[PDB]
Design a protein around this ligand. Structure first.
Ligand SMILES: Cc1cc2nc3c(=O)[nH]c(=O)nc-3n(C[C@H](O)[C@H](O)[C@H](O)COP(=O)(O)OP(=O)(O)OC[C@H]3O[C@@H](n4cnc5c(N)ncnc54)[C@H](O)[C@@H]3O)c2cc1C
Ligand SMILES: Cc1cc2nc3c(=O)[nH]c(=O)nc-3n(C[C@H](O)[C@H](O)[C@H](O)COP(=O)(O)OP(=O)(O)OC[C@H]3O[C@@H](n4cnc5c(N)ncnc54)[C@H](O)[C@@H]3O)c2cc1C
Lengths: 546, 549
């Protein structure tokens, strides 16, 4: 409703409330512990065997996750589901996404593999498929991407031709990088009827003509199964058509929303796990008669890691909190999808923010381990390789940076003040871009990108601050650290693209306006970062208590 | 002995000239071509097999490189070497960045493996070792690092005691991460006599008591052999003592200078390869009915990549060019080491700059390939993994960042405005460095964050300047690449200086300093979008690094 509580509304009015992890009720904390115990003695123990080929172990693990209720969170109760708030589904992603590639096995099943059926599945379809997906008896896979089509999903080339008796749809094509392909019982495949209508198709594993290429040799997440799905004259019952023929884009787009914030959450969990390894090793490794964790350059890293993680975590749950708020007393796939679509920009922001925060965390984590961070014997080595795929998933970060500004171009507390100034700078640059390129503003990708980065930092900075005022303790420091640098990036980012939007003398005032919108007093990043570092070493990881 | 020529002289005065890549005399352009041929026809064809176990293929490859004279470049003539200018061994390092792990095999051998003998090798021990190393008949290894000691190399605890006889030394200890250990014939090992005198020793592979752990499993450079070397009562002839007892630190410190600039050149080479791969893929991959290379965000990456590579490349060869001149009319280990040591600071700067530029280039290279960049079937995937080790090798970038400010701590109007901004960066560094000293004094070492921000300014200064001065001679796209780098360097300078200044000054005095830091980094907004797009177009046009061979 209110202009501030609506999607992207934070861009004009400050939120009068923000959901933080300190708001997790007892049911959320209960499941987080359940998940933590689950990965503690079920996933981690088989991780090494899985990283070495025994991908089939993903099957008995998904069954236990199912028996724990972790596979029925986002499933309607009338189909074996628990239908719980998105925060529960989110915290689960967070806690599961730090033990290994099993996070992708779980992620592909619970989101893209299951949601399409929940959002567009007919009664019969949901009755004979969902129960098994929520229990874990069956594992799902999503088949959209193809060799010559990825970011441009709607370009799939797989063909669907109606059989002579019109009782089946004959599919022919090749699916690229399909998660869970090695053992999924159900496949949601995308093909074009007569080569013209992008459509979704429920396809069972035991179907003639359906084969799979060998496991892909990847940089990371080796514990996850990824194969090419080959469809050669695969007859699919006409009743297995998911959604509307020609309207398969509707399924693809809607699931992406959940994939996004879910990934943001997982990135936070992995970043936290990586910080644990770094903090513990910074304490345990001694060089030059001193634990390296006591060296200025190591503290700088640890403090920065804690700061970015805190900012991303705040943004993620603030986003999820808004979503659940909107889903209150709201039933029906249409209503559910709409509620979520409301914060699509927020979803893209945290996904870009989270993936990138985790990139820094695992990078510096390796650095802290020195040569050892380059050994397969150290878990940090695996974290570095596994984290690289995140900037590609749920739409690459480039595609997401192009979407974030979308809903902006025709579609006293000093720190808080500066946050509001960040918002104004985004609007300013955004406006100047449109008042110069009009319709073809989407061509100026570099301009949109700069806008998106300011928006991401604005949202991130505000989430960190607002939460810091409520939490207190170290929180304010971690927020100050983030905001300081967000201001640095904003000024530089704006000055790198503004010259492209204006010139002459009319630009002179524009640049000055920017310098003013990003004005602030320099903070002692040295002192602040060390303070956070001390807290990190003292806690052996993320310094913010549960 | 001019003012600017001296090590760090570019900090007080402007250089009268800089050695650039287009200043390569035919001799250099020759060996470079030989290396390129050696890689495409010998090394590359075997890369896959070596990355899958057959590490012994390094032996025949090393023999071939030896017959080509690539292993004798930095070796004295009277020992089967060619004793050529450092520029040559540097370009060879750069061109070998396409051999994958073999680059480490070659690098460890020619630098840490051979140099110790060349620098401190006794007359007789150089005749019976150097010839084989220079020919490739014998592969050398360097054993300094230990499980408990890495950055603090001198903390090694491998012990050495003189036998009753007095003719041999008994070695006991463990050396960690030894490149070439799987097939090396000669080993330079560091130990302390009676646990107090850091000393280097020559140990032949076939020496009883010396064993090796299994091949280390790492994230990258799998084509390289890396094993743990164990010493259980190893007998070493007294004459096998390399250098002077207790002065083993000298060997370790001098080899690091060469390793750093050769690595910086290596990183530049790897970056170019990653760029070729990225440019090529950007032209072939079509999404949304158009080559991705036509989209703004991809062009931004391609432009930034070419810009950072140009800066690093300019700084690297300018550095080596200085060393070479300071080496003219000089022979002997002592003179050559002091000549190279003169630019220890520059070596560290290009070491940090190179590895960080390559890091960025392979990362965006992976991004450009989307999912396929995560696939072992695409070379960009291996390059991302192989690159990671560079920020650790030759001293971690943290250690190097602490060394750069060293010299700056040993003390207490338009017209070519671009070159002026470069001068201000130099001033910026001096301002911060000074304030740090006039506050913490002799204890300024503990303020590593402060030293790091100072080092990052010195790095961008040297790089930008070296990039700008070359653009003036080179012309063409050069100026554009130099401008792209300069603008960004100034932004990083302001942010960095201001992120460590509140630590040195406070109150009213602090505000004055803050305004000075800003003016010293004040610049006029440049259109990076336009400039990067211009570089991109050139990249896609040249299919990689736009600057002509
Ligand atoms: C593939 C490979 C090949 C190798 N080949 C060889 C070889 O041929 N010969 C050989 O001798 N060795 C070799 N090594 C090993 C290399 O020399 C060591 O790995 C390196 O010196 C180890 O440093 P470390 O890992 O022990 O530092 P840690 O990994 O012990 O260091 C972690 C830290 O360095 C910290 N640090 C250290 N000192 C300071 C300080 N004073 N101030 C601030 N921060 C500090 C960083 O900030 C960070 O916290 C090789 C290693 C690898 C991985
Ligand atoms: C481990 C793994 C698991 C996977 N699991 C699944 C799964 O379960 N189901 C599934 O369907 N798929 C899956 N995929 C594949 C994933 O969906 C595709 O890899 C992704 O969509 C591919 O994009 P691409 O690689 O084809 O882009 P390319 O790699 O084709 O894209 C390169 C480019 O995207 C560019 N780009 C594209 N459009 C634009 C634009 N408009 N503006 C600016 N830049 C643009 C970037 O800038 C860059 O140049 C998985 C992949 C991996 C690696």
């Amino acid at each position: 409703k209110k202009l501030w509580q609506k999607g992207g509304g934070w861009l004009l009015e400050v939120p009068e409330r923000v959901y933080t992890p300190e708001d997790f009720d007892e049911s959320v904390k209960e499941i987080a512990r359940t998940t933590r115990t689950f990965v503690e003695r079920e996933v981690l123990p088989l991780l090494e065997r899985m990283e070495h080929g025994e991908l089939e172990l993903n099957v008995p693990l998904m069954r236990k996750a199912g028996e724990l209720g972790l596979l029925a969170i986002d499933v309607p109760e009338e189909y074996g589901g628990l239908d719980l708030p998105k925060v529960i589904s989110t915290v689960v992603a967070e806690e599961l996404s730090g033990s290994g590639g099993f996070s992708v096995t779980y992620g592909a099943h619970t989101s893209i593999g299951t949601l399409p059926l929940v959002y567009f599945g007919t009664e019969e379809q949901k009755r004979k498929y969902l129960p098994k997906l929520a229990s874990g008896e069956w594992i799902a896979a999503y088949c959209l991407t193809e060799p010559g089509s990825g970011s441009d999903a709607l370009a799939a080339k797989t063909r669907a031709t109606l059989s002579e008796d019109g009782k089946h749809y004959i599919l022919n094509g090749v699916k690229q990088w399909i998660s869970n392909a090695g053992f999924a019982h159900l496949f949601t495949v995308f093909a074009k009827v007569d080569g013209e209508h992008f459509t979704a198709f429920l396809v069972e594993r035991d179907t003639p003509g359906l084969s799979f290429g060998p496991e892909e040799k990847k940089m990371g997440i080796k514990a996850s199964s990824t194969r090419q799905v080959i469809l050669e004259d695969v007859k699919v019952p006409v009743e297995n058509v998911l959604g509307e023929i020609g309207k398969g884009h509707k399924i693809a787009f809607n699931v992406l929303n959940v994939g996004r914030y879910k990934l943001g959450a997982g990135a936070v969990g992995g970043a936290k796990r990586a910080l644990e390894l770094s903090a513990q090793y910074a304490t345990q490794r001694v060089q030059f008669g001193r634990p390296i964790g006591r060296f200025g350059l190591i503290q700088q890293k640890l403090g920065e890691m804690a700061s970015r993680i805190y900012a991303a975590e705040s943004a993620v749950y603030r986003t999820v909190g808004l979503i659940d708020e909107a889903l209150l007393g709201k039933k029906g796939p249409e209503a559910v999808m709409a509620g979520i679509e409301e914060y699509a920009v927020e979803a893209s922001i945290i996904k870009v923010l989270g993936s990138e925060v985790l990139d820094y965390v695992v990078d510096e984590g390796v650095q802290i381990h020195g040569g050892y961070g380059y050994s397969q014997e150290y878990p940090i080595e695996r974290a570095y390789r596994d984290a690289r795929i995140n900037r590609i998933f749920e739409g690459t970060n480039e595609i997401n940076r192009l979407l974030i500004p979308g809903m902006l171009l025709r579609r006293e507390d000093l720190e808080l003040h500066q946050v509001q100034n960040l918002k104004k700078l985004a609007l300013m640059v955004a406006g100047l871009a449109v008042q110069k390129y009009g319709q073809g503003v989407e061509e100026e990708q570099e301009v949109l990108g700069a806008v998106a980065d300011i928006l991401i930092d604005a949202y991130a900075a505000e989430s960190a601050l607002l939460r810091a005022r409520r939490l207190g303790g170290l929180a304010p420091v971690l927020a100050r650290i983030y905001l300081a640098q967000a201001l640095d990036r904003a000024q530089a980012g704006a000055l790198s693209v503004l010259p492209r939007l204006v010139e002459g003398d009319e630009a002179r005032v524009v640049y000055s306006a920017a310098r003013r919108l990003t004005k602030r007093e320099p903070g002692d990043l040295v002192a602040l970062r060390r303070q956070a570092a001390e807290a990190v070493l003292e806690a052996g990881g993320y310094p913010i208590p549960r």
